[PDB]
Amino acid sequence: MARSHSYPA
Amino acid sequence: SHSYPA
Amino acid sequence: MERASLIQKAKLAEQAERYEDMAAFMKGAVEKGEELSCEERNLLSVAYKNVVGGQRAAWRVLSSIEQKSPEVREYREKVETELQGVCDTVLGLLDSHLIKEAGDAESRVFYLKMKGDYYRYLAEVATGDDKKRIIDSARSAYQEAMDISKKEMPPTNPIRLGLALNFSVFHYEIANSPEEAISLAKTTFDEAMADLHTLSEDSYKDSTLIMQLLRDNLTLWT
Amino acid sequence: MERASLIQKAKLAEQAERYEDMAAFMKGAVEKGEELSCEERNLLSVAYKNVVGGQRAAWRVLSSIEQKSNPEVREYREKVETELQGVCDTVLGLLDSHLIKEAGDAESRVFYLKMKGDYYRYLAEVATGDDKKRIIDSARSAYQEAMDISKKEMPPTNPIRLGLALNFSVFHYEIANSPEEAISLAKTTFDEAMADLHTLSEDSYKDSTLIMQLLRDNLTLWT
Ligand SMILES: [Ca+2]
């Protein structure tokens, strides 16, 4: 788990 | 222009 | 100073990549009492996202150094405390000036999502019980934003997608439910694709980028 | 707190990319009264350099936006200036009331005088009228003194001597408005480095080679 993406970034 | 350190 | 100039200085701040200054200006513009336009709204999340992003990154770097075999802890706590200061500031700004202080469904979802994100960040650094409380206040904000988006917005509206994206991150990284995160991310993606046709060049670029983020997460999660 | 832990926190801060915190940690270390080691001096410069690098880049954005001449924009740029000057000022106090001369070896002496020249240079960039002139002078005198010592204590390839020469040449071109002098210094600094490199082992070859490149790039861009 390498940190998921969120929005805005 | 380039300087050091950058 | 005047709201008009406060807004102007934020734009300048973002130009010079001085997010801390940018977030302060926006805060001054908010306390002026008047609602923010779509453009203004984005200035607000961009400023605070950048400020808090730096701290979250600092925190993660430190906490990992702490776990990987006195100073580390003391410094992690300083960073943590500074990060909680910003989140409380953003949350206070939302609770007494932005949330449901308007009418539009988009503005309402936007603010409630923002509340979910900052509680989520507070949750990343909290421990037992305090964490449970924070986690639950994060979810109710996301869920309320979600309820409004599913009744007021089409499956491709970028705000709704941004909300669903972040709510899935919440399930996976915070609520410890990988199952739920994956299905929501997948379900959000499909219903999004199934409508991509004639999504108008309006919010095209935005929803398109979030749809890709959803995929990246699905891949990383599986 | 203990000096050793201040240094450790500066290293943690650097990894966390919190340069402002780092700078403040090294400042505490410097105030302990003990000389800085080579690694410690680099920590100190990395810190403040990154802090100031950000203000400068910001000032340069707000300036072009303002177009040097042709409200809000003016007020904000001035605030970024004040800040830049604040950082420069605490760095200069650190050097003048602690680090300069309290050192022995040539290396450190040249390193701090160079640093002193470097920050007066940053103050110059945002200065106008006669203020700039006075600033340019004190920057020149610090760089010169550093130059006088490097030419007398170190070989043409010492990375620190090269760095000083590099920055001093940049000063001549971008600040002192003396291109020719800026070019000759760079040329000479570079050549003298060559006719001596045939004996410079990788024990430091890499270092000089890196700086030598920056000298030719500037030489190329100034022509
Ligand atoms: Ca208020």
Side-chain angles (χ1 to χ4, degrees), chain C residues 106-137:
Chain C
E106 291 202 58
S107 60
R108 283 187 296 141
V109 178
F110 186 99
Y111 293 133
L112 283 166
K113 166 189 180 298
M114 203 166 159
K115 179 173 188 156
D117 299 327
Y118 287 86
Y119 269 116
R120 171 158 58 80
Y121 303 146
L122 281 175
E124 305 183 328
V125 319
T127 53
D129 271 277
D130 296 67
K131 197 173 186 176
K132 299 177 183 186
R133 181 198 77 247
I134 294 179
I135 283 177
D136 282 70
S137 60

PDB file of all heavy atoms in Angstrom, chain C residues 106-137:
ATOM      1  N   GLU C 106     -24.262  21.644  -5.581  1.00  0.00           N
ATOM      2  CA  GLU C 106     -22.826  21.544  -5.806  1.00  0.00           C
ATOM      3  C   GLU C 106     -22.031  22.198  -4.691  1.00  0.00           C
ATOM      4  O   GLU C 106     -21.080  21.618  -4.178  1.00  0.00           O
ATOM      5  CB  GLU C 106     -22.474  22.192  -7.146  1.00  0.00           C
ATOM      6  CG  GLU C 106     -22.976  21.419  -8.351  1.00  0.00           C
ATOM      7  CD  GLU C 106     -22.209  21.748  -9.618  1.00  0.00           C
ATOM      8  OE1 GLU C 106     -20.972  21.571  -9.625  1.00  0.00           O
ATOM      9  OE2 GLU C 106     -22.842  22.181 -10.604  1.00  0.00           O
ATOM     10  N   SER C 107     -22.417  23.409  -4.316  1.00  0.00           N
ATOM     11  CA  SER C 107     -21.722  24.086  -3.238  1.00  0.00           C
ATOM     12  C   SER C 107     -21.888  23.325  -1.921  1.00  0.00           C
ATOM     13  O   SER C 107     -20.954  23.254  -1.128  1.00  0.00           O
ATOM     14  CB  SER C 107     -22.258  25.517  -3.129  1.00  0.00           C
ATOM     15  OG  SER C 107     -23.645  25.519  -2.859  1.00  0.00           O
ATOM     16  N   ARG C 108     -23.064  22.740  -1.697  1.00  0.00           N
ATOM     17  CA  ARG C 108     -23.292  21.977  -0.470  1.00  0.00           C
ATOM     18  C   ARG C 108     -22.472  20.695  -0.420  1.00  0.00           C
ATOM     19  O   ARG C 108     -21.886  20.362   0.606  1.00  0.00           O
ATOM     20  CB  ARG C 108     -24.778  21.660  -0.337  1.00  0.00           C
ATOM     21  CG  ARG C 108     -25.619  22.839   0.123  1.00  0.00           C
ATOM     22  CD  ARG C 108     -27.045  22.397   0.398  1.00  0.00           C
ATOM     23  NE  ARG C 108     -27.701  21.918  -0.820  1.00  0.00           N
ATOM     24  CZ  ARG C 108     -28.532  20.879  -0.876  1.00  0.00           C
ATOM     25  NH1 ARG C 108     -28.823  20.186   0.225  1.00  0.00           N
ATOM     26  NH2 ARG C 108     -29.074  20.532  -2.039  1.00  0.00           N
ATOM     27  N   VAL C 109     -22.417  19.977  -1.532  1.00  0.00           N
ATOM     28  CA  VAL C 109     -21.640  18.755  -1.570  1.00  0.00           C
ATOM     29  C   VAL C 109     -20.156  19.060  -1.431  1.00  0.00           C
ATOM     30  O   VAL C 109     -19.428  18.366  -0.720  1.00  0.00           O
ATOM     31  CB  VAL C 109     -21.854  18.003  -2.884  1.00  0.00           C
ATOM     32  CG1 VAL C 109     -20.983  16.754  -2.905  1.00  0.00           C
ATOM     33  CG2 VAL C 109     -23.324  17.645  -3.040  1.00  0.00           C
ATOM     34  N   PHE C 110     -19.716  20.107  -2.119  1.00  0.00           N
ATOM     35  CA  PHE C 110     -18.321  20.515  -2.066  1.00  0.00           C
ATOM     36  C   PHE C 110     -17.863  20.745  -0.615  1.00  0.00           C
ATOM     37  O   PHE C 110     -16.879  20.165  -0.173  1.00  0.00           O
ATOM     38  CB  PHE C 110     -18.169  21.791  -2.906  1.00  0.00           C
ATOM     39  CG  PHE C 110     -16.741  22.244  -3.065  1.00  0.00           C
ATOM     40  CD1 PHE C 110     -16.025  21.944  -4.230  1.00  0.00           C
ATOM     41  CD2 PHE C 110     -16.084  22.894  -2.027  1.00  0.00           C
ATOM     42  CE1 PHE C 110     -14.678  22.276  -4.349  1.00  0.00           C
ATOM     43  CE2 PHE C 110     -14.727  23.233  -2.136  1.00  0.00           C
ATOM     44  CZ  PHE C 110     -14.026  22.921  -3.295  1.00  0.00           C
ATOM     45  N   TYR C 111     -18.596  21.573   0.123  1.00  0.00           N
ATOM     46  CA  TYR C 111     -18.264  21.860   1.521  1.00  0.00           C
ATOM     47  C   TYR C 111     -18.338  20.641   2.441  1.00  0.00           C
ATOM     48  O   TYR C 111     -17.452  20.446   3.271  1.00  0.00           O
ATOM     49  CB  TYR C 111     -19.174  22.998   1.997  1.00  0.00           C
ATOM     50  CG  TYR C 111     -18.858  24.299   1.284  1.00  0.00           C
ATOM     51  CD1 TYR C 111     -19.866  25.097   0.734  1.00  0.00           C
ATOM     52  CD2 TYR C 111     -17.534  24.721   1.143  1.00  0.00           C
ATOM     53  CE1 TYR C 111     -19.560  26.283   0.058  1.00  0.00           C
ATOM     54  CE2 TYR C 111     -17.218  25.891   0.482  1.00  0.00           C
ATOM     55  CZ  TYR C 111     -18.230  26.671  -0.060  1.00  0.00           C
ATOM     56  OH  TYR C 111     -17.887  27.845  -0.691  1.00  0.00           O
ATOM     57  N   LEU C 112     -19.366  19.811   2.299  1.00  0.00           N
ATOM     58  CA  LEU C 112     -19.458  18.616   3.133  1.00  0.00           C
ATOM     59  C   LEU C 112     -18.331  17.621   2.816  1.00  0.00           C
ATOM     60  O   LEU C 112     -17.825  16.917   3.703  1.00  0.00           O
ATOM     61  CB  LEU C 112     -20.845  17.992   2.935  1.00  0.00           C
ATOM     62  CG  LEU C 112     -21.959  18.738   3.697  1.00  0.00           C
ATOM     63  CD1 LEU C 112     -23.359  18.324   3.234  1.00  0.00           C
ATOM     64  CD2 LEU C 112     -21.775  18.456   5.182  1.00  0.00           C
ATOM     65  N   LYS C 113     -17.925  17.552   1.553  1.00  0.00           N
ATOM     66  CA  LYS C 113     -16.821  16.665   1.208  1.00  0.00           C
ATOM     67  C   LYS C 113     -15.550  17.175   1.895  1.00  0.00           C
ATOM     68  O   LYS C 113     -14.759  16.412   2.471  1.00  0.00           O
ATOM     69  CB  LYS C 113     -16.653  16.668  -0.317  1.00  0.00           C
ATOM     70  CG  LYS C 113     -15.334  16.059  -0.824  1.00  0.00           C
ATOM     71  CD  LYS C 113     -15.154  16.315  -2.318  1.00  0.00           C
ATOM     72  CE  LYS C 113     -13.865  15.725  -2.853  1.00  0.00           C
ATOM     73  NZ  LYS C 113     -12.646  16.304  -2.219  1.00  0.00           N
ATOM     74  N   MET C 114     -15.371  18.488   1.832  1.00  0.00           N
ATOM     75  CA  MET C 114     -14.215  19.114   2.451  1.00  0.00           C
ATOM     76  C   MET C 114     -14.181  18.810   3.958  1.00  0.00           C
ATOM     77  O   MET C 114     -13.122  18.575   4.544  1.00  0.00           O
ATOM     78  CB  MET C 114     -14.298  20.614   2.165  1.00  0.00           C
ATOM     79  CG  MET C 114     -12.960  21.299   2.253  1.00  0.00           C
ATOM     80  SD  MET C 114     -12.965  22.945   1.533  1.00  0.00           S
ATOM     81  CE  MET C 114     -11.569  23.601   2.334  1.00  0.00           C
ATOM     82  N   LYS C 115     -15.352  18.794   4.582  1.00  0.00           N
ATOM     83  CA  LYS C 115     -15.424  18.460   5.994  1.00  0.00           C
ATOM     84  C   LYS C 115     -14.984  17.008   6.214  1.00  0.00           C
ATOM     85  O   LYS C 115     -14.283  16.698   7.176  1.00  0.00           O
ATOM     86  CB  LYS C 115     -16.867  18.698   6.447  1.00  0.00           C
ATOM     87  CG  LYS C 115     -17.172  18.393   7.908  1.00  0.00           C
ATOM     88  CD  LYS C 115     -18.586  18.853   8.237  1.00  0.00           C
ATOM     89  CE  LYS C 115     -18.874  18.745   9.718  1.00  0.00           C
ATOM     90  NZ  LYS C 115     -19.961  19.688  10.141  1.00  0.00           N
ATOM     91  N   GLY C 116     -15.389  16.129   5.305  1.00  0.00           N
ATOM     92  CA  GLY C 116     -15.006  14.724   5.390  1.00  0.00           C
ATOM     93  C   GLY C 116     -13.500  14.567   5.248  1.00  0.00           C
ATOM     94  O   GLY C 116     -12.865  13.870   6.043  1.00  0.00           O
ATOM     95  N   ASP C 117     -12.915  15.235   4.254  1.00  0.00           N
ATOM     96  CA  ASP C 117     -11.461  15.154   4.044  1.00  0.00           C
ATOM     97  C   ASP C 117     -10.651  15.610   5.255  1.00  0.00           C
ATOM     98  O   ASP C 117      -9.688  14.952   5.633  1.00  0.00           O
ATOM     99  CB  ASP C 117     -11.033  16.008   2.829  1.00  0.00           C
ATOM    100  CG  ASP C 117     -11.670  15.554   1.512  1.00  0.00           C
ATOM    101  OD1 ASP C 117     -11.900  14.335   1.338  1.00  0.00           O
ATOM    102  OD2 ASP C 117     -11.926  16.426   0.647  1.00  0.00           O
ATOM    103  N   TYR C 118     -11.015  16.743   5.855  1.00  0.00           N
ATOM    104  CA  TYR C 118     -10.238  17.224   7.003  1.00  0.00           C
ATOM    105  C   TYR C 118     -10.430  16.397   8.266  1.00  0.00           C
ATOM    106  O   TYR C 118      -9.522  16.296   9.080  1.00  0.00           O
ATOM    107  CB  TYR C 118     -10.491  18.720   7.206  1.00  0.00           C
ATOM    108  CG  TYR C 118      -9.778  19.503   6.123  1.00  0.00           C
ATOM    109  CD1 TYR C 118     -10.394  19.736   4.887  1.00  0.00           C
ATOM    110  CD2 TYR C 118      -8.437  19.885   6.274  1.00  0.00           C
ATOM    111  CE1 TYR C 118      -9.703  20.315   3.827  1.00  0.00           C
ATOM    112  CE2 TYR C 118      -7.731  20.472   5.214  1.00  0.00           C
ATOM    113  CZ  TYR C 118      -8.371  20.678   3.990  1.00  0.00           C
ATOM    114  OH  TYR C 118      -7.681  21.196   2.913  1.00  0.00           O
ATOM    115  N   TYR C 119     -11.599  15.799   8.434  1.00  0.00           N
ATOM    116  CA  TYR C 119     -11.749  14.909   9.558  1.00  0.00           C
ATOM    117  C   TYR C 119     -10.924  13.673   9.245  1.00  0.00           C
ATOM    118  O   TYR C 119     -10.291  13.099  10.132  1.00  0.00           O
ATOM    119  CB  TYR C 119     -13.223  14.548   9.751  1.00  0.00           C
ATOM    120  CG  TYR C 119     -13.963  15.486  10.683  1.00  0.00           C
ATOM    121  CD1 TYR C 119     -15.012  16.279  10.216  1.00  0.00           C
ATOM    122  CD2 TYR C 119     -13.631  15.563  12.039  1.00  0.00           C
ATOM    123  CE1 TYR C 119     -15.718  17.126  11.072  1.00  0.00           C
ATOM    124  CE2 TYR C 119     -14.330  16.407  12.914  1.00  0.00           C
ATOM    125  CZ  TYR C 119     -15.371  17.185  12.419  1.00  0.00           C
ATOM    126  OH  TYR C 119     -16.061  18.027  13.254  1.00  0.00           O
ATOM    127  N   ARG C 120     -10.909  13.277   7.965  1.00  0.00           N
ATOM    128  CA  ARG C 120     -10.105  12.126   7.552  1.00  0.00           C
ATOM    129  C   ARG C 120      -8.627  12.342   7.873  1.00  0.00           C
ATOM    130  O   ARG C 120      -7.944  11.419   8.340  1.00  0.00           O
ATOM    131  CB  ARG C 120     -10.284  11.852   6.043  1.00  0.00           C
ATOM    132  CG  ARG C 120      -9.301  10.782   5.496  1.00  0.00           C
ATOM    133  CD  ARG C 120      -9.771  10.107   4.196  1.00  0.00           C
ATOM    134  NE  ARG C 120     -10.006  11.077   3.138  1.00  0.00           N
ATOM    135  CZ  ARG C 120      -9.050  11.621   2.396  1.00  0.00           C
ATOM    136  NH1 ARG C 120      -7.784  11.273   2.587  1.00  0.00           N
ATOM    137  NH2 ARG C 120      -9.355  12.540   1.483  1.00  0.00           N
ATOM    138  N   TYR C 121      -8.126  13.552   7.622  1.00  0.00           N
ATOM    139  CA  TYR C 121      -6.726  13.837   7.917  1.00  0.00           C
ATOM    140  C   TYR C 121      -6.490  13.784   9.414  1.00  0.00           C
ATOM    141  O   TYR C 121      -5.463  13.250   9.875  1.00  0.00           O
ATOM    142  CB  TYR C 121      -6.335  15.221   7.395  1.00  0.00           C
ATOM    143  CG  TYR C 121      -6.555  15.423   5.922  1.00  0.00           C
ATOM    144  CD1 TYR C 121      -6.941  16.670   5.436  1.00  0.00           C
ATOM    145  CD2 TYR C 121      -6.394  14.375   5.006  1.00  0.00           C
ATOM    146  CE1 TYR C 121      -7.171  16.879   4.090  1.00  0.00           C
ATOM    147  CE2 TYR C 121      -6.629  14.578   3.636  1.00  0.00           C
ATOM    148  CZ  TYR C 121      -7.024  15.839   3.197  1.00  0.00           C
ATOM    149  OH  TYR C 121      -7.348  16.076   1.894  1.00  0.00           O
ATOM    150  N   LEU C 122      -7.430  14.360  10.173  1.00  0.00           N
ATOM    151  CA  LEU C 122      -7.323  14.320  11.628  1.00  0.00           C
ATOM    152  C   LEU C 122      -7.303  12.859  12.079  1.00  0.00           C
ATOM    153  O   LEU C 122      -6.587  12.495  13.006  1.00  0.00           O
ATOM    154  CB  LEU C 122      -8.504  15.088  12.254  1.00  0.00           C
ATOM    155  CG  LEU C 122      -8.374  16.625  12.250  1.00  0.00           C
ATOM    156  CD1 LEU C 122      -9.656  17.263  12.788  1.00  0.00           C
ATOM    157  CD2 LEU C 122      -7.161  17.061  13.097  1.00  0.00           C
ATOM    158  N   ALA C 123      -8.056  12.015  11.376  1.00  0.00           N
ATOM    159  CA  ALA C 123      -8.092  10.593  11.714  1.00  0.00           C
ATOM    160  C   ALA C 123      -6.766   9.895  11.422  1.00  0.00           C
ATOM    161  O   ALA C 123      -6.395   8.963  12.125  1.00  0.00           O
ATOM    162  CB  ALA C 123      -9.219   9.887  10.970  1.00  0.00           C
ATOM    163  N   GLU C 124      -6.037  10.350  10.408  1.00  0.00           N
ATOM    164  CA  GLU C 124      -4.767   9.705  10.078  1.00  0.00           C
ATOM    165  C   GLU C 124      -3.749   9.751  11.218  1.00  0.00           C
ATOM    166  O   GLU C 124      -2.916   8.851  11.337  1.00  0.00           O
ATOM    167  CB  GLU C 124      -4.153  10.363   8.832  1.00  0.00           C
ATOM    168  CG  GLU C 124      -5.042  10.394   7.594  1.00  0.00           C
ATOM    169  CD  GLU C 124      -4.341  10.995   6.378  1.00  0.00           C
ATOM    170  OE1 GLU C 124      -3.480  11.892   6.555  1.00  0.00           O
ATOM    171  OE2 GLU C 124      -4.661  10.580   5.241  1.00  0.00           O
ATOM    172  N   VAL C 125      -3.823  10.788  12.054  1.00  0.00           N
ATOM    173  CA  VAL C 125      -2.876  10.960  13.154  1.00  0.00           C
ATOM    174  C   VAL C 125      -3.455  10.745  14.564  1.00  0.00           C
ATOM    175  O   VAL C 125      -2.740  10.890  15.554  1.00  0.00           O
ATOM    176  CB  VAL C 125      -2.226  12.373  13.096  1.00  0.00           C
ATOM    177  CG1 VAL C 125      -1.895  12.725  11.649  1.00  0.00           C
ATOM    178  CG2 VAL C 125      -3.160  13.426  13.694  1.00  0.00           C
ATOM    179  N   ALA C 126      -4.735  10.398  14.666  1.00  0.00           N
ATOM    180  CA  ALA C 126      -5.340  10.176  15.977  1.00  0.00           C
ATOM    181  C   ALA C 126      -5.173   8.742  16.468  1.00  0.00           C
ATOM    182  O   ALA C 126      -4.883   7.828  15.685  1.00  0.00           O
ATOM    183  CB  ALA C 126      -6.826  10.542  15.944  1.00  0.00           C
ATOM    184  N   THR C 127      -5.363   8.555  17.774  1.00  0.00           N
ATOM    185  CA  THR C 127      -5.258   7.237  18.399  1.00  0.00           C
ATOM    186  C   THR C 127      -6.508   6.866  19.200  1.00  0.00           C
ATOM    187  O   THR C 127      -7.272   7.743  19.621  1.00  0.00           O
ATOM    188  CB  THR C 127      -4.037   7.158  19.336  1.00  0.00           C
ATOM    189  OG1 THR C 127      -4.086   8.242  20.274  1.00  0.00           O
ATOM    190  CG2 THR C 127      -2.741   7.222  18.534  1.00  0.00           C
ATOM    191  N   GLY C 128      -6.691   5.557  19.392  1.00  0.00           N
ATOM    192  CA  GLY C 128      -7.825   4.998  20.120  1.00  0.00           C
ATOM    193  C   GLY C 128      -8.898   5.923  20.666  1.00  0.00           C
ATOM    194  O   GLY C 128      -8.597   6.908  21.332  1.00  0.00           O
ATOM    195  N   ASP C 129     -10.156   5.586  20.398  1.00  0.00           N
ATOM    196  CA  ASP C 129     -11.318   6.357  20.849  1.00  0.00           C
ATOM    197  C   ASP C 129     -11.436   7.749  20.238  1.00  0.00           C
ATOM    198  O   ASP C 129     -12.475   8.082  19.669  1.00  0.00           O
ATOM    199  CB  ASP C 129     -11.308   6.412  22.375  1.00  0.00           C
ATOM    200  CG  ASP C 129     -12.048   5.240  22.994  1.00  0.00           C
ATOM    201  OD1 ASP C 129     -13.294   5.308  23.092  1.00  0.00           O
ATOM    202  OD2 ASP C 129     -11.388   4.242  23.364  1.00  0.00           O
ATOM    203  N   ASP C 130     -10.404   8.574  20.370  1.00  0.00           N
ATOM    204  CA  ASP C 130     -10.447   9.884  19.736  1.00  0.00           C
ATOM    205  C   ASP C 130     -10.520   9.656  18.227  1.00  0.00           C
ATOM    206  O   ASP C 130     -11.151  10.410  17.478  1.00  0.00           O
ATOM    207  CB  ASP C 130      -9.179  10.665  20.104  1.00  0.00           C
ATOM    208  CG  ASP C 130      -9.078  10.950  21.601  1.00  0.00           C
ATOM    209  OD1 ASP C 130      -8.918   9.983  22.384  1.00  0.00           O
ATOM    210  OD2 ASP C 130      -9.161  12.135  21.997  1.00  0.00           O
ATOM    211  N   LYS C 131      -9.879   8.571  17.802  1.00  0.00           N
ATOM    212  CA  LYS C 131      -9.879   8.193  16.405  1.00  0.00           C
ATOM    213  C   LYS C 131     -11.281   7.774  15.973  1.00  0.00           C
ATOM    214  O   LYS C 131     -11.778   8.230  14.936  1.00  0.00           O
ATOM    215  CB  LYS C 131      -8.879   7.056  16.229  1.00  0.00           C
ATOM    216  CG  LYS C 131      -8.451   6.823  14.792  1.00  0.00           C
ATOM    217  CD  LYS C 131      -7.343   5.800  14.727  1.00  0.00           C
ATOM    218  CE  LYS C 131      -6.801   5.665  13.321  1.00  0.00           C
ATOM    219  NZ  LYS C 131      -5.641   4.724  13.288  1.00  0.00           N
ATOM    220  N   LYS C 132     -11.919   6.926  16.785  1.00  0.00           N
ATOM    221  CA  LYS C 132     -13.280   6.459  16.514  1.00  0.00           C
ATOM    222  C   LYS C 132     -14.264   7.614  16.385  1.00  0.00           C
ATOM    223  O   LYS C 132     -15.149   7.590  15.534  1.00  0.00           O
ATOM    224  CB  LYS C 132     -13.735   5.532  17.644  1.00  0.00           C
ATOM    225  CG  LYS C 132     -12.878   4.289  17.811  1.00  0.00           C
ATOM    226  CD  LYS C 132     -13.331   3.446  18.998  1.00  0.00           C
ATOM    227  CE  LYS C 132     -12.420   2.243  19.187  1.00  0.00           C
ATOM    228  NZ  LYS C 132     -12.924   1.323  20.244  1.00  0.00           N
ATOM    229  N   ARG C 133     -14.127   8.620  17.238  1.00  0.00           N
ATOM    230  CA  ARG C 133     -15.015   9.769  17.162  1.00  0.00           C
ATOM    231  C   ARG C 133     -14.780  10.555  15.871  1.00  0.00           C
ATOM    232  O   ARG C 133     -15.716  10.932  15.171  1.00  0.00           O
ATOM    233  CB  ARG C 133     -14.754  10.677  18.370  1.00  0.00           C
ATOM    234  CG  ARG C 133     -15.647  11.917  18.417  1.00  0.00           C
ATOM    235  CD  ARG C 133     -15.083  13.007  19.347  1.00  0.00           C
ATOM    236  NE  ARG C 133     -13.969  13.741  18.739  1.00  0.00           N
ATOM    237  CZ  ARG C 133     -12.712  13.697  19.169  1.00  0.00           C
ATOM    238  NH1 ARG C 133     -12.392  12.955  20.220  1.00  0.00           N
ATOM    239  NH2 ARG C 133     -11.770  14.393  18.545  1.00  0.00           N
ATOM    240  N   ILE C 134     -13.511  10.804  15.575  1.00  0.00           N
ATOM    241  CA  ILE C 134     -13.127  11.544  14.382  1.00  0.00           C
ATOM    242  C   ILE C 134     -13.545  10.806  13.118  1.00  0.00           C
ATOM    243  O   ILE C 134     -14.077  11.403  12.186  1.00  0.00           O
ATOM    244  CB  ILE C 134     -11.605  11.777  14.376  1.00  0.00           C
ATOM    245  CG1 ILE C 134     -11.228  12.699  15.545  1.00  0.00           C
ATOM    246  CG2 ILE C 134     -11.168  12.349  13.041  1.00  0.00           C
ATOM    247  CD1 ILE C 134      -9.744  12.998  15.670  1.00  0.00           C
ATOM    248  N   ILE C 135     -13.319   9.497  13.111  1.00  0.00           N
ATOM    249  CA  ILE C 135     -13.675   8.658  11.982  1.00  0.00           C
ATOM    250  C   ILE C 135     -15.166   8.709  11.694  1.00  0.00           C
ATOM    251  O   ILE C 135     -15.597   8.760  10.535  1.00  0.00           O
ATOM    252  CB  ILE C 135     -13.269   7.188  12.245  1.00  0.00           C
ATOM    253  CG1 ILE C 135     -11.762   7.024  12.047  1.00  0.00           C
ATOM    254  CG2 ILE C 135     -14.061   6.249  11.355  1.00  0.00           C
ATOM    255  CD1 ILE C 135     -11.264   5.625  12.347  1.00  0.00           C
ATOM    256  N   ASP C 136     -15.960   8.692  12.756  1.00  0.00           N
ATOM    257  CA  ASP C 136     -17.394   8.722  12.585  1.00  0.00           C
ATOM    258  C   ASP C 136     -17.909  10.078  12.132  1.00  0.00           C
ATOM    259  O   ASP C 136     -18.905  10.163  11.421  1.00  0.00           O
ATOM    260  CB  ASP C 136     -18.048   8.252  13.892  1.00  0.00           C
ATOM    261  CG  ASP C 136     -17.991   6.724  14.056  1.00  0.00           C
ATOM    262  OD1 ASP C 136     -16.886   6.163  14.272  1.00  0.00           O
ATOM    263  OD2 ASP C 136     -19.057   6.076  13.951  1.00  0.00           O
ATOM    264  N   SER C 137     -17.231  11.148  12.522  1.00  0.00           N
ATOM    265  CA  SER C 137     -17.681  12.453  12.080  1.00  0.00           C
ATOM    266  C   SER C 137     -17.256  12.684  10.633  1.00  0.00           C
ATOM    267  O   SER C 137     -17.853  13.485   9.919  1.00  0.00           O
ATOM    268  CB  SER C 137     -17.129  13.529  13.024  1.00  0.00           C
ATOM    269  OG  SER C 137     -15.723  13.518  13.036  1.00  0.00           O
TER     270      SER C 137
END
